[PDB]
Structure formats: C-alpha cells, structure tokens
Design a protein around this ligand. Structure first.
Ligand code: SAM
Length: 281
C-alpha cells in the first residue's frame, strides 16, 4: 500500500535541480541558483564533520549520490551510502564508479538498521523523517557505536512542534498543521514521522553525544520549496504524462503546503551536529 506512492526518477527531475537533491538548499549568499544552493548545503553539512583525507564517510539516506561524490572530490575520503530505493541505488552506483579517485566508494541497498561497519563520520540529510519515533534510541546508539573516539555526525531534518507548542498559535491552525503533517507522512514519505528539534537533540544526548545549538534552515526551505513548486507547475503537462493528474496534484499540495507552513512558522528544518566525547575542538 505504501508502494502505491512510489514515483519514477522521471517525475522528480521535473522539479529538482540537476544534482537531484531532495532536501532544503542553502542560499548563502542569497543570490545562488537552486543548483548552487544545493552544493552550498552539502558543503554546510560536510564542513561540520572534521573530515580528513583517507577517512570513511557514511551517508545514511544517500539519495542520488551528490553528497557522496562531493565529499570524495572535496575531502579525498572513502564513502559508503545507504538507501532503500532500488532506483537511487542504481544511479548512485553509476555516479560513484565514475569518480576519478583511488578512494573506496560503495552504495548499499539497506537501512541503517542493517549497517554495522566501522566508519569515521556520518552525514544524514532528510532521511531521519522516515525512521519513526520508536527507532530513535537505536539510531543514535548505532551511530555512536560505529564511529571512533573523535566521531561526528550531522542530521538535517524537517521538524514539527509538540501539539502543546502548536495550540499556543491557536487551535484552528494547530489541527490543520497536524493534518498536513499526516498527509506528508502518508502520501509523500509513507511510514514517516516528523520529529521535533527537541527529540533530535535529546535522543542524541541520551546516546552520549555532545549537541551544540541546532541550526534552523526555515528561510532557506521557504525559497527551496517556492522554486520546486514553480518548476513542477511549469512542467505540468510533462509531469502528468510521466505519472498522472493524481501524482501532480499530490506533489503541488505538498510543495505549496510546505512553503505555507514554513512561512507561518508551523514547521522548521534543523541541522543538528552530534559530537562524540573525543571529537576535535
Ligand atoms: C528525501 S531523500 C534525501 C536524500 C538525500 N540525502 C538528499 O539530500 O537528496 C530520503 C533518503 O532516505 C533514505 N532512507 C529512508 N529510510 C532509511 C533508512 N532506515 N536507512 C537508510 N536510508 C533510509 C531513502 O531511501 C532516501 O535515499
């Protein structure tokens, strides 16, 4: 039933930039194109990790391979990617195999639940919303355990607020946001659950990480979603012929709706850094 909501790489290409990044971009400086801003976001995350030549970076939820390839090119690291999409696995294999490097590059069709190999640093961009609340302690424990004494990880994720925090903004908007979030986690990312920033932080701490102040990316997601939404709309006829009127309308509701709730400050997007006790200063 969650399989009813699988969509082809054809469709995503009709709103995403040529890197095929499916996550909040970083418009610093403000005038960057979406493509440039996606590279800036990858850099934003990678720069937090204290990566040195010859380390192994794990990317959990590696999408179509851009983050891994950028890490190899910039940092001369080995890379391992995990994805649960067979399509993304295939594209990543092609992206990774054709990098001019001596470093090791591997993409695995499996979840973090199944991965327990030593790595030096971890990046996870907008996969965390798929994991589910019940699995947070296990996720952070696993990340802590596979890393060395100086390990670091970044996790970028959309977030909501506790229903109490929301009801402070008025009951009407609070219930309407809760419904829209249920839509995201049913029709866009089936089986998902949006965390709060507080859950992301506290679960990391319980596992033993040091957690600095999270970075809010909300204004940047506003811009990202506007550009996505404008692109899909411009590509409407193509999108419908690639899929259906149903999928097109589904993604326009998601894109326009997310832009609206981020604007209204009912959603946020946090980039959280997790530092192990022996992490560099
Ligand atoms: C919204 S995409 C983000 C992809 C990429 N990080 C980016 O910024 O474009 C979500 C990714 O998370 C992956 N994913 C979901 N649950 C996962 C899990 N339990 N373990 C590993 N990957 C997972 C999906 O297969 C997909 O690659």
């Amino acid at each position: 039933i969650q399989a009813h909501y699988d969509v082809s790489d054809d469709f995503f290409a009709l709103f995403q930039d040529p890197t095929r990044t499916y996550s909040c971009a970083y418009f610093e400086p403000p005038e960057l194109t979406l493509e440039e801003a996606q590279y800036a976001k990858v850099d934003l995350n990678l720069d937090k990790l204290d990566l040195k030549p010859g380390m192994t970076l794990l990317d959990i939820g590696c999408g179509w391979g851009t983050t891994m390839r950028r890490a190899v090119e910039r940092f001369d690291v080995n890379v391992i990617g995990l994805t649960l999409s067979k399509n993304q696995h295939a594209r990543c294999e092609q992206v990774l195999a054709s990098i001019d490097t001596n470093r090791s590059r591997q993409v695995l069709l499996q979840g973090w639940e199944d991965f327990a190999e030593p790595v030096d640093r971890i990046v996870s961009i907008e996969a965390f919303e798929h994991f589910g609340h019940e699995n947070y302690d296990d996720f952070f424990k696993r990340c802590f355990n596979i890393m060395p004494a100086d390990g670091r990880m970044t996790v970028q994720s959309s977030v909501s607020y506790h229903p109490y925090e929301m009801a402070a903004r008025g009951k009407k908007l609070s219930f309407e946001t809760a419904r829209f979030i249920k839509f995201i986690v049913t029709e866009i990312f089936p089986g998902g659950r949006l965390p709060s920033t507080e859950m992301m932080v506290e679960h990391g701490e319980k596992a033993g990480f040091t957690v600095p102040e999270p970075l809010s990316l909300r204004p940047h997601y506003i811009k990202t979603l506007r550009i996505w939404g404008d692109t899909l709309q411009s590509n409407k006829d193509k999108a419908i012929e690639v899929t259906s009127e149903e999928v097109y309308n589904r993604y326009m509701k998601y894109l326009r709706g997310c832009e609206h709730y981020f604007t209204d400050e009912m959603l946020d997007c946090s980039l959280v850094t997790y530092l192990k006790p022996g992490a560099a200063a």
